[PDB]
Every structure is written in structure tokens, then in C-alpha cells.
Design a protein around this motif. Structure first.
Motif, mmCIF file in Angstrom:
data_model
loop_
_atom_site.group_PDB
_atom_site.id
_atom_site.type_symbol
_atom_site.label_atom_id
_atom_site.label_comp_id
_atom_site.label_asym_id
_atom_site.label_seq_id
_atom_site.Cartn_x
_atom_site.Cartn_y
_atom_site.Cartn_z
ATOM 1 N N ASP A 179 8.532 6.041 -4.569
ATOM 2 C CA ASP A 179 8.131 4.866 -5.353
ATOM 3 C C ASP A 179 6.614 4.810 -5.559
ATOM 4 N N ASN A 180 5.854 5.200 -4.520
ATOM 5 C CA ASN A 180 4.399 5.232 -4.577
ATOM 6 C C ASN A 180 3.953 6.506 -5.256
ATOM 7 N N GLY A 181 4.850 7.480 -5.349
ATOM 8 C CA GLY A 181 4.566 8.774 -5.942
ATOM 9 C C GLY A 181 3.803 9.681 -4.998
ATOM 10 N N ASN A 182 3.996 9.489 -3.680
ATOM 11 C CA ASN A 182 3.360 10.261 -2.604
ATOM 12 C C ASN A 182 4.189 11.507 -2.274
ATOM 13 N N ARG A 198 -4.350 8.561 -1.314
ATOM 14 C CA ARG A 198 -3.057 8.632 -0.657
ATOM 15 C C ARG A 198 -1.969 7.833 -1.363
ATOM 16 N N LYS A 199 -2.275 7.325 -2.561
ATOM 17 C CA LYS A 199 -1.335 6.566 -3.400
ATOM 18 C C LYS A 199 -0.717 5.387 -2.644
ATOM 19 N N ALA A 200 -1.549 4.765 -1.810
ATOM 20 C CA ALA A 200 -1.147 3.657 -0.980
ATOM 21 C C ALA A 200 -0.928 2.391 -1.752
ATOM 22 N N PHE A 201 0.243 1.724 -1.565
ATOM 23 C CA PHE A 201 0.611 0.426 -2.138
ATOM 24 C C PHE A 201 0.797 0.434 -3.627
ATOM 25 N N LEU A 202 0.768 1.613 -4.242
ATOM 26 C CA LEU A 202 0.867 1.767 -5.671
ATOM 27 C C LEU A 202 2.104 1.167 -6.319
ATOM 28 N N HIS A 203 3.265 1.307 -5.693
ATOM 29 C CA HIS A 203 4.495 0.747 -6.238
ATOM 30 C C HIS A 203 4.477 -0.790 -6.364
ATOM 31 N N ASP A 234 4.024 3.166 3.126
ATOM 32 C CA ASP A 234 3.411 2.392 2.048
ATOM 33 C C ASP A 234 1.899 2.527 2.031
ATOM 34 N N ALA A 235 1.251 2.546 3.196
ATOM 35 C CA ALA A 235 -0.190 2.734 3.326
ATOM 36 C C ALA A 235 -0.608 4.195 3.108
ATOM 37 N N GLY A 236 0.345 5.133 3.149
ATOM 38 C CA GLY A 236 0.100 6.558 2.941
ATOM 39 C C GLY A 236 -0.617 7.259 4.079
ATOM 40 N N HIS A 237 -0.385 6.825 5.329
ATOM 41 C CA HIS A 237 -1.034 7.413 6.510
ATOM 42 C C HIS A 237 -0.168 8.475 7.130
ATOM 43 N N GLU A 270 -0.135 3.981 -13.214
ATOM 44 C CA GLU A 270 -1.106 4.591 -12.280
ATOM 45 C C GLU A 270 -2.424 4.916 -13.042
#
Ligand SMILES: Nc1nc2c(ncn2[C@@H]2O[C@H](COP(=O)(O)OP(=O)(O)OP(=O)(O)O)[C@@H](O)[C@H]2O)c(=O)[nH]1
Ligand SMILES: Nc1nc2c(ncn2[C@@H]2O[C@H](COP(=O)(O)OP(=O)(O)O)[C@@H](O)[C@H]2O)c(=O)[nH]1
Ligand SMILES: Nc1ncnc2c1ncn2[C@@H]1O[C@H](COP(=O)(O)OP(=O)(O)O)[C@@H](O)[C@H]1O
Ligand code: ALF
Ligand code: ALF
Ligand SMILES: [Mg+2]
Ligand SMILES: [Mg+2]
Ligand SMILES: [Mg+2]
Lengths: 159, 430, 431, 333
Positions: A145-148, C391-396, A112-115, C405
Motif C-alpha cells: 500500500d505504501n509501495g515499499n 522509506r515511503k513511510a505513511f504514504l498510503h 507503515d513507518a518503513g523501519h 506519490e
């Protein structure tokens, strides 16, 4: 643990390296909790204070101590992007697959944080790629879901 | 008989009006209730009721109520009829466009209706005396709107201004140079003669001559009132010089656009001056040619005179005056334009200048006000034009005016007119 | 004009708003019951700017209290001046926004917005001459930030000709651990740049730094930070609340402070800096007030004013002092520090002196600056935002609430343009 | 490859109002490119005298934009001028009168006439939108429900009006029916300066999209055809009430257009496109990827000298602005 406890939590979140050492020597409780259930270790894991994480663990802090939301310091260093702290906790017996009250694992939180680098290290140490949170989401579902894209590719192979 | 209607616009205009009307009452012996135990020339400025009460031939206008609310609650609340004190709800917020358009267009018809009612009571209306600041949204915007509307309704009837030129010591808006240039451009073809009062000149006289550390509007207005009374005494008392509004134009205005005389007043003496006795006619006359006693900061020695009028009041003898003018001629490098009668015009009133009882000014046996049209006054326009240029080059604050229905072209137009005015002062007496 | 309509949204908004009302009620001599017990006619001259006069001798704040969480409302009612507020003006939800700007702006906030507008319309239509609106909120949370900006847009749509003023508290990692604060702050700044006429940038980074560094408070609380906020809010509203010549209303202030529409973010400053209920006395002199008020250490926004240029400045001195000394000291500062004031805006520093000092002090000074150095605050938020967004963090969490977005991309683009605009005027020359 | 913005000046014959008052024809003309006002020469890309026809204006201003749009470029044509200088006349005109129609109806025709000539194995997809900026709100001219549309950014941070009625046209007839519909929604009021004074900024947008069935190659072209409202002094217009509120907004977006041009001609590192909604829509036409032609309108009356001068000097400034024009890809990473 009394006056020393409040002072230890304050010193750990402020990154007062020497002041932490002094309070330990004076007998401050390593696992003294704050209003949220956070121990000096959770605070040092939030704020990114590596040297403090190490002194605390050397002085026998509880590596798996859970706050009121059920988060361990591993959940926190993973959320806050502190790679070096995540490596230190894991090397000192942190529960790779610890679950908070929301069904979150450190892997859900790092995804979720993208790390990316934290995800790579959590998987190395045995993070369950198939673990579901209370929303019925896995670390991979969070990534899509975040699109990462980068992260979803990384997790796809295992999942 | 030969009536003059006074219009007081915005805070500066209204507050200066309070000071002027207080002084006129003292000069004519009129009490704050309009009664006088003392036909006569004061009738040009005051109408009379059947009950023997003397009412100022004036209109006070402001877009916000607070300043005029003080008039209608103060000493002098019985002097003016309520209909001649006009207030809106929302001011022009230091914006010429709100004064001229947005807010001003809401009250313009009502103000003209009240001036029309005053003009209907006149048997020989000469015209209007308009008091306003250059800097305020009402003083700038509403005045230009009113001036245009008065030219329509009154045609050829004379219009004179008493304009408050901005000074940073007492300024309330960063946009004052914009408001000043826009009002000057719009009012130029509608005004016959305008007396600018530079707030810095008045501020410096209060500090230097009256020993006031930090002059307030109260201090500035008492001194302004003294100069206004000198300029209007020729209309309110029986003289030979500037007896009417047309005589002001003939004697001070050689060209229509070059209508900005310089006023110099002497003596300005502190109420604390205890042993220092009475100044001679020569001393007070000499003081008129010194720049420190001027109403506008500028250097006449760097300019040329095109008209000069000396208005004496009190214990003054014609032999004393002629002697003083002759010495001035042999002394000071006082140059007149090549195309002009090199001569002064002298007014003598035997009533000494009246001072407000708890005022800063000392009572003097003799005073003088010199009215001169000098090309040196162009220096005041240059100062203002430069401040305009600095901001305008960046279009700083422009959005506030355009938002209220003004076009950017109006800014360029106004500034080009100011540039032509500066060019006119240069061409005049080359 | 006369009446100002005050809106308090979310936890921060309500805590700082409540403090504002207790500080100003004490200055105007109003007790917690609404009765005037003061001893100066100056206290009541402009009382109508913030208070409605109700049946009898009572004065009621023209204030609307808003939150998606009920708890804060209870805390306000239980407070010292809690009973002064109109009971019908408390508009509260039951859910909360969970530090999510999207919940505050599009979801839970949208469900509560009309109930709030019902109450703001009632207060506004009762005004003889409405100046506009004053909103207190944080940019880091969900309600204050998302719902607060939703309210700004809705109020503006219905009152386009009124002034929109905010006291916007900027987030800092030093005071709050909430991960998503940069998102919430960037999404809000995007709304403020387009929809407010004037915004007081109250930075928690600066408030924390003042408490820790200057006040020597090892572990500052919201109580310590709020003491500086309330001193600032009292200072910046002095001109609106008492008879005076300068910046006497919201529009005259905007005309003097805002040379370009988007550049409406003020850097407030205050002197002397004090800790809560601590004596004191010793009263600062005019040169001391003048120096201290222009110092980076006294700024309520974490920017060094010496890193930029002042477009415009409003300086307010409070207490019995020499107006000559104030004028000399103010002129000295701008002659000596000529380089920190844009040359193309002449006489851009305006001074006011109010005889009434705030409580506890004999002498004080408040500074309101429109400085190009405020870009430092926006750059700090932008850097934090991009680190996460890259990094698209927490976006959802946000897209799940119906946001796109693209709003994140657009908000970020807008904030960077704001920075770029400040830089342009910082470098500009009169030539 | 680059090429500056093309600025073309068009003077109209003195109107009845002008003639039925003093008014001297103040413009004097040297060659096909210079107008002389008060012995000062203002030179443009092509100056049209009062006598110039609608077909003459079209042939020298647009016609070129039709080839370019079809080739994958972006084209913008906007008419700038003071109230009643001929903006709507140049752009709209007698929509149906063959000799009397403006630029827009002529582009619409020549778009299809060129296409029928184009490669038989070329698939075209033309969609059109029509909207106004009345009272600083983007109102759709093909949907009356859509009253406050928003300007948004695309992936390349290129602004566009999100949610306007996009209508897929297949014939010039299909387009004219929608222009007719659009015109008949566009706000107009009566000023002393103009009996049918446009009260909004008309934005007509042709979106041509082409794909070759063999080359698998795709091209795109955004054609903006803007009829702006005119700058107006209250003194001249007599604009009062709702008419004046309309004026307040026209001057605001317009001073902002000038600010954008000023910025670009001066090469100031900023450019305040974010100032008016209009100036964000034209963002691409102004600094970047579009071939832009500005048609500046002037009244040769002595009455309107000050304003005619200010329109000419905008033109002069604008003509210096260099666009960064290239072909449109429609690519997939
Ligand atoms: N001499 C003098 N100048 C004054 C006075 N009041 C205001 N001014 C000056 O006039 C300018 C401000 O204009 P104001 O007259 O106060 O404003 P206004 O005409 O009421 O217009 P708005 O308030 O904007 O609607 C500044 O240059 C002030 O210094 C006064 O009583 N005397
Ligand atoms: N200065 C100040 N900041 C506060 C206060 N309460 C919360 N904050 C800040 O506001 C942000 C959190 O937003 P909050 O107001 O709690 O959220 P909301 O109730 O959903 O609007 C963080 O940056 C906190 O540091 C307060 O009383 N004073
Ligand atoms: N070149 C021209 N030749 C003849 N008439 C013209 C010309 N340009 C404009 N007109 C006429 O002038 C009037 C006003 O033009 P219009 O385009 O509507 O104003 P605006 O410039 O504000 O958009 C119309 O009646 C129009 O037909
Ligand atoms: F009270 Al919130 F996010 F709604 F802190
Ligand atoms: F039709 Al117009 F200004 F009069 F655009
Ligand atoms: Mg006023
Ligand atoms: Mg809350
Ligand atoms: Mg038109």
C-alpha cells in the motif's frame, strides 16, 4: 503520583537523565501517567532517550503499559524508528504482538513507518506477520500500500 | 493675462504645493478664504471670482485620497474649489508602472478635463509648473503620463518641473532609483526646464542651519517652499528677469536636454538666532557659491557654468550687487563654458522674504536665490544611475514592473538615455 | 487601498488568530462588545483596515473563522473577545482532518471550501478597496495546512490582483510529536512558494527555544509560544494599522521586501522578549532595541541571520523615543555589519517609528527580514521529509485520499529549488 | 554529444505601417551570418535577409530536427521576437499554401515522407498535443473544457503539461486537421503594432515513439514547436483593456524566458525555470536533453531599432548555451 509524577514525565520527555534519577530516589511513581495515558517510558520511547528507558525499566517501569489509544512503549519506539529502544524493550519482556485501539501491532507501525531493521528485530522476537488491524490490513498489506518494495520482499517469505 | 497653471502630483507634489500656496497667500496678502483687502502680477497664479475671491490656478492629483483629504479639511479648504482636488482610491504602490499604466490610465482623462477647464479661463496661458517626487509611483509614473498628454493637448506651451530627488534619510521605497530613471527618461523630451530638489541637501540645511535634530517633511517643505517662491516671484511680481516661462528656458537652458538648473538660496537662518544681526549683499552673494546652501548635492568647482541668474529680494541696492559680483569674479574659481557669455543676470524685488509665522526660518531684510546651469549637476544623475545599475544587474524587483505591462527593454532604454545624458554633460564645455 | 480580509484555519490558526484580535482590539481601544472606548484619534484613523463598522458605535473584525473540527470554534466563542466576531463568519465541519494534509486539501477540506468562499466573497464584495488577504495557520496539521493552502489557491483564482499574506507556523519535534508533520509542511511550502506574495515564517522551533533558553520556562505551553506570536503579529501589522509613511499597505510592503517572486518568506524578530503577564518596567533604550532586534536569540524563525545576508529589512520602533537616536543606531548596525546586507540592493533597510507602544511595554522593536539564512528552516524540513519519504513511510495515508506519490516528489523538488535560489543570492556579488 | 543552441536570425520586409511613415531599413548584412546595426555586428548561426523564402528558412533551421527526432533525440524550435516581427509567419504561415506555409506544416510532411522511407520492420506511434499559454494558464487547443492544465515533473524531474489532448495521428492529413482545429481556438487580438497579434504562446508537440520488431529496441522523441507571443511597449501597441491584460502576461513570461537564458549563458548555479510556466516546459530544451534552434525575428525598421537590438542581444547570449543532448532509451529497471 503528585508533583513528582508531572516532573518525572517532563524529565523523561526532555531527556534529563540525572533529573530522572533524582525524582526516582525522591519517590516519583515510575508509572505516573500523562493526559494521554503515557507513562515516562512511553515518552522516553517517543523521544529516543535510551539511557532513560533503561533507568525506568531498572526501577520497575511497566514495559507493557498502554496509553488511552492502547499503545505500549514498543508500539512507540517502532513508530518513531528507535531501533536500540525496540531491542531494549524486547529484552525486558515487551509484548511483541500488543494491539492498540486501531488494531495496530508494533509490526504494523514499523512497516507503515518503513523501519526495515525494526521489522527484522520484531519478526526475530515473534511478531505475527498474519495479524490484521481494524482496517483489515496486515504488515505486508501496509508495505504494498505504501509501495515499499524492500519491506514487501522481507515480509513475503513468511506471509 | 500671462497665466501659469500649477499641477501638484502625488504626496510630495501635493505637500510641497500646500507649503507653496500658503506662502504665496502670505506674500500677496490673500486670506485662507481667498479674500484680500489689498491688474497686479499675482493674477498669473490666482484667478478672481465675481465675489472678489482669489483662487489658485492649480490642480492637485493623487491616486490615493489621504494627502489631498488633509487639504480639503485643513486651513485653506475654502481657497481651492473641490473640482481642482482630484483623488482616486488605490495608489501606485511605489511602482512607476502602476502610476503610468495600471492605475494612472483610470484618472488621466479626468485630470486633463480639469486642467482643460482651468486653461479655458486663461486669456494668455504661458504653460505649466509640475510638482512631483521622482521616487513615488504616482510622482514618477503618473507625472510622465501627464507630461506626454500635456504635450499632445498644449503643443508648444512651456512646461517646468519641481522634482523631488530621493534621499535615503527620508526614502520610503527600495525601488526609488528605478522610478527616478524611468520618469526622467519618459519626461525628458516633454519638459523645458526642471528644478531638482535633493531631499538630502534640504535635510542637511535643516540640520546644519536651522538646528533641527530630525527634520520632518513639514521642516523640509517650509524650506522648499522658500526656494520655489523665489523662483516663481519673477512671475507673480513685476520684474525685469524671468518674467515669463519662455525667459526661464532662454536664460537657463543652452541645450534642450541640459535643462536642470541648480538653485542656491541664502540666508537660511534659525528663528532662535537672537543677537546675530543682518547679512550684507556681499555676504549673501558669497553664500550662493558655497556648496552647503545648494538644493542639490554636487560640486560646482568640479564643473562649468553655462548660465547664472541672481534673484535678490528685499533691502538690496544695484550698486551693492555689482560690487558683490565683481569681487566674486576676482575670488572664486568660477569657470564658464568657452561657448558662453560670461555674465550674470540680476533680478531685484523690493519685497523682503516672507516667512510662515510659527516656522523655523527667521525673517530677513534681504535674501537671494541663484539659478545656475552647471555641468556639476551630472553628479546627482551618476549617484542615481549607480543605484539603478546595482539592482538592475540582478533584475531585483523587475518582476513588479513587468507584471504591470512594462517591458524589460524600457529599463535598458531609460538607462541608455541616462548614460547619453551623462555623456552630454561631459561633452558640454570640454 | 484599505480593507484586509482575515482568515483563521485549523487549531493553530484559530488560537493565534484569536490572540491577534484581542491584542489589536486593545491597541485600537475596542472592547469585547465591539464598542470603541479608547482615548486617541490615532486608534480610529485606520480602523477600517481590519474592522467593519456595523449599526451604531460597533466595530466588527473582517475575520472568517475556519476549521474541520468544531471544538476550536467553541473555544474561540468562549474566549475573552469571542463575542466580537460575526456569528455567520464561523465556518466549521464536524469530522476533522486527523493531521492529514490530503484530508484538508482534497477530501474533507474540499467539502467545506465552498461554504468558506461564500463567506469570504461576502466580506470582499463589501470592501470599497480590498488590499487582500491575511491567513493564520500551521503547516504541520491537516486543516490549517491542507485546507488553508486549498483556500489560498481558490481565493487567488478569484482575486488574482490582491495581495496574499500568511502567518505560517512551521512544525518542530520540540513542541509536537505528530510523525507526519514534515510531509504536511513540505506539501504546504510547495503551495506557499507558488501562491503567496508574502509569508511570515513563524517557527515553533524558535518559539520553543526562546521560551526555554531566554524566558527560562522549563515546559513551555501553546500559551507561552502564542504570547511571542501575538507580539510579532502586532509588530508586523503596526504599519498597516496606524498612520505612517513606510509599508503602509500590503502591496507597498511586498514591493519593498520581495526582490524576486519566490523569495517571499520573512524571518520576523522582536525585542524585548517577555514572558506572559509578568512585570517588567525598566524600558529598553534605543541602542538596546537596535542590538536585541538583530540578534539570532530574538528571531521567530530558527535561523542564524549571521549565516546569511539580508536582501531587505523592515524595522519598526514603537514608543516615545528620539528619532535621531533611532537613525544613528540603525545606520551604525548596517555600517558595522556591512557584510550581512547585500551590496546590490542599496538602502535595503527601512525604518518606521510609531508613537503608540504595545500594551505592557513603553518601548519595543519589530524586525522583518528577507534573509538568505531562512534556507536553514527549509533545509531542516527537507531533511526530516526525505528521511521519511526515502522509506515511503505513511504514504498510503495520503495516496488513499486520492493524492499521487508524484506530488510528494514535486513538493520536495520545489522546496530544494527554493533553498538553491536563496544560496545563489547569498553568494552573489555586486562586483 | 553536446553542441550549443543554434540561433538563427530572420528579418522581414518593412511592413505597410513602417513604409507609410518615415522608417529606414537599418539592418546591413555581411555574409550568410552577420547583421550590422549601428556599426555593431551581431553574428548568428545563419542570418536570413528580408527576401528569404519559407522553404529557405525551413531548409536551414529545421529539416535537421526531423532526422534527429526519428533517431531518438528531442527537438525544440521556438520563434522569439518583438510584436509583429514575423513569429507566427515563420512557424504557422499559410498552413495550406505550398510555397507560403511555415516551419510546423513542413515538419509534419517531412516527418511522414522520411517515415515511409524508414525500415519496413519499424513500428511508429505518433501522438500530438496543441495548447496555448493565454493569460498565464495552459489552455488546450483541442479541448475547450481543459482551460487550466498543470505543468508537472516526470520520474527524471523533467517538466511536462499533464492532461493535454493527446491525439494519435497516422497521416499528415490527420495532423493538419488537428493544427486547423488548434489554430482556430488560439487567442488573437488587434494591436496598433499587429492586426492579428498572437495573444498566447502556441505549443505544438509531436511525440514520436518507435519500436523495432526484431531489435526489440525502443526510441522516443519529443518535438516542441513553439510560436511565442511578442514583447510589446504600450506606446506602440495602443494596447488597452483586455488587450493590455494580455500584454502584461506576455511581457512577464518573456522577461522570465530572458532570465533563464541570462542564467545559462552566465553559468549561474541556479536558472529560474520555476519563474514562468513556459520556462518550465522549455526546461529540457534549455539546459539539457534536446537539440534546440531558436528563430529570432526582427523588424528592419528604424522605429523598432531599440527592440531589434534587444532581440539580437538575447540571440547572442542564447547561442552560447550548451545543451547536454543524448538518445532516448524507454528503459525498464
Ligand atoms: N520633500 C518632500 N519629499 C517628500 C514628501 N512626501 C514624500 N516625499 C518623498 O517622495 C518620495 C516618495 O514619493 P511619494 O510622493 O510619497 O509617493 P506618491 O507620488 O504619492 O506615489 P505612490 O504613493 O506610490 O502612489 C520619497 O523620496 C519621499 O522622501 C514631502 O512632503 N516632502
Ligand atoms: N504556536 C502554536 N502552534 C500550535 C498551536 N496549536 C497547534 N500548534 C501547532 O500546529 C501543528 C498542529 O496543527 P494543528 O493546528 O493542530 O492542526 P489543524 O487543526 O488540523 O490545522 C503543530 O506543529 C503544533 O505544534 C497554537 O496554539 N500555537
Ligand atoms: N518574412 C516575412 N515576409 C513577409 N511578411 C512577413 C514576414 N514575417 C512576417 N510577415 C507578415 O507580418 C505580419 C505579422 O507577422 P506575425 O508573425 O503575425 O507577428 P508576430 O511576430 O507577433 O507573431 C503578418 O501579416 C505576416 O504575414
Ligand atoms: F484539527 Al486537525 F489535523 F484537523 F489537528
Ligand atoms: F503576433 Al505577436 F506579438 F504580434 F506574437
Ligand atoms: Mg502616496
Ligand atoms: Mg483541530
Ligand atoms: Mg504571431
Amino acid at each position: 503520583g503528585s508533583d513528582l509524577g508531572k516532573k518525572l514525565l517532563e524529565a523523561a520527555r526532555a531527556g534529563q537523565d540525572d533529573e530522572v534519577r533524582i525524582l526516582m530516589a525522591n519517590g516519583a511513581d515510575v508509572n505516573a501517567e500523562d493526559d494521554s495515558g503515557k507513562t515516562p517510558l512511553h515518552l522516553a520511547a517517543i523521544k529516543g532517550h535510551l539511557e532513560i528507558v533503561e533507568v525506568l525499566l531498572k526501577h520497575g517501569a511497566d514495559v507493557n503499559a498502554a496509553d488511552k489509544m492502547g499503545d505500549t512503549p514498543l508500539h512507540l519506539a517502532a513508530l518513531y524508528g528507535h531501533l536500540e529502544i525496540v531491542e531494549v524493550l524486547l529484552k525486558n519482556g515487551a509484548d511483541v504482538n500488543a494491539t492498540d485501539t486501531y488494531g495496530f501491532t508494533p509490526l504494523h507501525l514499523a512497516a507503515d513507518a518503513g523501519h526495515l531493521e525494526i521489522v527484522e528485530v520484531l519478526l526475530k522476537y515473534g511478531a505475527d506477520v498474519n495479524a490484521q488491524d481494524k482496517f483489515g490490513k496486515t504488515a505486508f498489506d501496509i508495505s504494498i500500500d505504501n509501495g515499499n518494495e524492500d519491506l514487501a520482499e522481507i515480509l513475503q517469505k513468511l506471509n | 493675462m500671462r497665466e501659469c497653471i500649477s499641477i501638484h502630483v502625488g504626496q510630495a507634489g501635493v505637500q510641497i504645493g500646500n507649503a507653496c500656496w500658503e506662502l504665496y497667500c502670505l506674500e500677496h496678502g490673500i486670506q485662507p478664504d481667498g479674500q484680500m483687502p489689498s491688474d497686479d502680477s499675482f493674477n498669473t497664479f490666482f484667478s478672481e471670482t465675481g465675489a472678489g475671491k482669489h483662487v489658485p490656478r492649480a490642480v492637485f492629483v493623487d491616486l490615493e485620497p489621504t494627502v489631498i483629504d488633509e487639504v480639503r479639511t485643513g486651513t485653506y479648504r475654502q481657497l481651492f474649489h473641490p473640482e481642482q482636488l482630484i483623488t482616486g482610491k488605490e495608489d501606485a504602490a511605489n511602482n512607476y508602472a502602476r502610476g503610468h499604466y495600471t492605475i494612472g490610465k483610470e484618472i488621466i482623462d479626468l485630470v486633463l478635463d480639469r486642467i482643460r477647464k482651468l486653461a479655458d479661463q486663461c486669456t494668455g496661458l504661458q504653460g505649466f509648473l509640475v510638482f512631483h517626487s521622482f521616487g513615488g509611483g504616482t510622482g514618477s509614473g503618473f507625472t510622465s503620463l501627464l507630461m506626454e498628454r500635456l504635450s499632445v493637448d498644449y503643443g508648444k506651451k512651456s512646461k517646468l518641473e519641481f522634482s523631488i530627488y530621493p534621499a535615503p534619510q527620508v526614502s520610503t521605497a527600495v525601488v526609488e532609483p528605478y522610478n527616478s530613471i524611468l520618469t526622467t527618461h519618459t519626461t525628458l523630451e516633454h519638459s523645458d526646464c526642471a528644478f531638482m530638489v535633493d531631499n538630502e541637501a534640504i535635510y542637511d540645511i535643516c540640520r546644519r542651519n536651522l538646528d533641527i535634530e530630525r527634520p520632518t517633511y513639514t521642516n523640509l517643505n517650509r524650506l522648499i517652499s522658500q526656494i520655489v517662491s523665489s523662483i516663481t516671484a519673477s512671475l507673480r511680481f513685476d520684474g525685469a528677469l524671468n518674467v515669463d516661462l519662455t525667459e526661464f528656458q532662454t536664460n537657463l537652458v543652452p541645450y534642450p536636454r541640459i535643462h536642470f538648473p541648480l538653485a542656491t538660496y541664502a540666508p537660511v537662518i534659525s528663528a532662535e538666532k537672537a543677537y546675530h544681526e543682518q547679512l550684507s549683499v556681499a555676504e549673501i552673494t558669497n553664500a550662493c557659491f558655497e556648496p552647503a546652501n545648494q538644493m542639490v548635492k554636487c560640486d560646482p568647482r568640479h564643473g562649468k557654468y553655462m548660465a547664472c541668474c541672481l534673484l535678490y529680494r528685499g533691502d538690496v541696492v544695484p550698486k551693492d550687487v555689482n560690487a558683490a559680483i565683481a569681487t566674486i569674479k576676482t575670488k572664486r574659481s568660477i569657470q564658464f563654458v568657452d561657448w558662453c557669455p560670461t555674465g550674470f543676470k540680476v533680478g531685484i524685488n523690493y519685497q523682503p522674504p516672507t516667512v510662515v509665522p510659527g516656522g523655523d526660518l527667521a525673517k530677513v531684510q534681504r535674501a537671494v536665490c541663484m539659478l545656475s546651469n552647471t555641468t556639476a549637476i551630472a553628479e546627482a544623475w551618476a549617484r542615481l544611475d549607480h543605484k539603478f545599475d546595482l539592482m538592475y544587474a540582478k533584475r531585483a524587483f523587475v518582476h513588479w514592473y513587468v507584471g504591470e505591462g512594462m517591458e524589460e527593454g524600457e529599463f535598458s532604454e531609460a538607462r541608455e538615455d541616462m548614460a547619453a545624458l551623462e555623456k552630454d554633460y561631459e561633452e558640454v564645455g570640454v | 487601498m484599505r480593507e484586509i480580509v482575515h482568515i483563521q484555519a485549523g487549531q493553530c490558526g484559530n488560537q493565534i488568530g484569536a490572540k491577534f484580535w484581542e491584542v489589536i482590539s486593545d491597541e485600537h481601544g475596542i472592547d469585547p462588545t465591539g464598542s470603541y472606548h479608547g482615548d486617541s484619534d490615532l486608534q480610529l484613523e485606520r480602523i477600517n483596515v481590519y474592522y467593519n463598522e456595523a449599526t451604531g458605535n460597533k466595530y466588527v473584525p473582517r475575520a472568517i473563522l475556519v476549521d474541520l473540527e468544531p471544538g476550536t470554534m467553541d473555544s474561540v466563542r468562549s474566549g475573552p473577545f469571542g463575542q466580537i466576531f460575526r456569528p455567520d463568519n464561523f465556518v466549521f465541519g464536524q469530522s476533522g482532518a486527523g493531521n492529514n494534509w490530503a484530508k484538508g486539501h482534497y477530501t474533507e477540506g474540499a467539502e467545506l471550501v465552498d461554504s468558506v468562499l461564500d463567506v469570504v466573497r461576502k466580506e470582499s464584495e463589501s470592501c470599497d478597496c480590498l488590499q487582500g488577504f491575511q491567513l493564520t495557520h500551521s503547516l504541520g496539521g491537516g486543516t490549517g495546512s491542507g485546507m488553508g493552502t486549498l483556500l489560498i489557491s481558490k481565493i487567488r483564482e478569484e482575486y488574482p490582483d490582491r495581495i496574499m499574506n500568511t502567518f505560517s507556523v512551521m512544525p518542530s519535534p520540540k513542541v509536537s510529536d505528530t510523525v507526519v508533520e514534515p510531509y504536511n509542511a513540505t506539501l504546504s511550502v510547495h503551495q506557499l512558494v507558488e501562491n503567496t506574495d508574502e509569508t511570515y515564517s513563524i517557527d515553533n522551533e524558535a518559539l520553543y527555544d526562546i521560551c526555554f533558553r531566554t524566558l527560562k520556562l522549563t515546559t513551555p505551553t501553546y500559551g507561552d509560544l502564542n504570547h511571542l506570536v501575538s507580539a510579532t503579529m502586532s509588530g508586523v501589522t503596526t504599519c498597516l494599522r496606524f498612520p505612517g509613511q513606510l509599508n503602509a499597505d500590503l502591496r507597498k510592503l511586498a514591493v519593498n521586501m520581495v526582490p524576486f517572486p519566490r523569495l517571499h518568506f520573512f524571518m520576523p524578530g522582536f525585542a524585548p522578549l517577555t514572558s506572559r503577564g509578568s512585570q517588567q518596567y525598566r524600558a529598553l533604550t534605543v541602542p538596546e532595541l537596535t542590538q536585541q532586534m538583530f540578534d539570532s536569540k530574538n528571531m521567530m524563525a530558527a535561523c542564524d541571520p549571521r549565516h546569511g545576508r539580508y536582501l531587505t529589512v523592515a524595522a519598526i520602533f514603537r514608543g516615545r523615543m528620539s528619532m535621531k537616536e533611532v537613525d544613528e543606531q540603525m545606520l551604525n548596525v548596517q555600517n558595522k555589519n556591512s557584510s550581512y546586507f547585500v551590496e546590490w540592493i542599496p538602502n535595503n533597510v527601512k525604518t518606521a517609528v510609531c508613537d503608540i507602544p504595545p500594551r505592557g511595554l513603553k518601548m519595543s522593536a519589530t524586525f522583518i527580514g528577507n534573509s538568505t539564512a531562512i534556507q536553514e528552516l527549509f533545509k531542516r524540513i527537507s531533511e526530516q521529509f526525505t528521511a521519511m519519504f526515502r522509506r515511503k513511510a505513511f504514504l498510503h495515508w495520503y495516496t488513499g485520499e486520492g493524492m499521487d506519490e508524484m506530488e510528494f516528489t514535486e513538493a520536495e523538488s520545489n522546496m530544494n529549488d527554493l533553498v538553491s535560489e536563496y544560496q545563489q543570492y547569498q553568494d552573489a556579488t555586486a562586483d | 554529444a553536446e553542441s550549443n543552441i543554434k540561433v538563427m536570425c530572420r528579418f522581414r520586409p518593412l511592413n505597410e505601417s513602417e513604409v507609410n511613415r518615415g522608417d529606414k531599413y537599418i539592418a546591413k548584412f555581411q555574409g550568410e551570418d552577420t547583421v550590422v546595426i549601428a556599426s555593431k555586428p551581431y553574428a548568428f548561426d545563419r542570418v536570413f535577409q528580408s527576401s528569404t523564402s519559407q522553404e529557405q528558412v525551413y531548409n536551414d533551421a529545421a529539416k535537421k530536427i526531423v532526422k534527429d527526432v526519428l533517431e531518438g533525440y528531442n527537438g525544440t524550435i521556438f520563434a522569439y521576437g518583438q510584436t509583429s516581427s514575423g513569429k507566427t509567419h515563420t512557424m504557422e504561415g499559410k498552413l495550406h499554401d505550398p510555397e507560403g506555409m511555415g516551419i510546423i506544416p513542413r515538419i509534419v510532411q517531412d516527418i511522414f515522407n522520411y517515415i515511409y522511407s524508414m525500415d519496413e520492420n519499424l513500428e511508429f506511434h505518433i501522438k500530438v498535443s496543441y495548447f496555448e499559454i493565454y493569460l498565464d494558464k495552459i489552455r488546450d487547443l483541442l479541448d475547450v473544457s481543459k482551460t487550466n492544465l498543470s505543468v508537472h515533473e516526470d520520474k527524471n524531474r523533467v517538466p511536462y503539461v499533464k492532461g493535454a489532448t493527446e491525439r494519435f495521428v497516422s497521416s499528415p492529413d490527420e495532423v493538419m486537421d488537428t493544427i486547423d482545429e488548434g489554430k482556430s481556438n488560439r487567442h488573437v487580438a488587434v494591436t496598433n503594432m499587429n492586426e492579428h497579434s498572437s495573444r498566447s504562446h502556441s505549443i505544438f508537440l509531436i511525440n514520436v515513439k518507435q519500436e523495432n520488431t526484431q531489435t526489440e529496441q525502443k526510441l522516443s522523441g519529443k518535438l516542441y514547436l513553439v510560436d511565442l507571443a511578442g514583447s510589446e511597449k504600450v506606446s506602440k501597441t495602443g494596447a488597452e483593456g483586455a488587450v493590455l491584460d494580455e500584454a502584461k502576461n506576455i511581457n512577464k513570461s518573456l522577461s522570465a524566458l530572458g532570465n533563464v537564458i541570462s542564467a545559462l549563458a552566465e553559468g549561474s548555479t541556479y536558472v529560474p525555470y520555476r519563474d514562468s510556466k513556459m520556462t518550465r516546459i522549455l526546461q529540457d530544451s534549455l539546459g539539457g536533453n534536446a537539440r534546440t534552434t531558436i528563430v529570432i525575428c526582427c523588424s528592419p525598421s528604424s522605429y523598432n531599432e531599440s527592440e531589434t537590438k534587444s532581440t539580437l542581444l538575447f540571440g547572442q547570449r542564447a547561442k552560447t548555451i550548451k545543451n547536454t543532448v543524448s538518445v532516448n532509451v524507454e528503459l525498464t529497471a
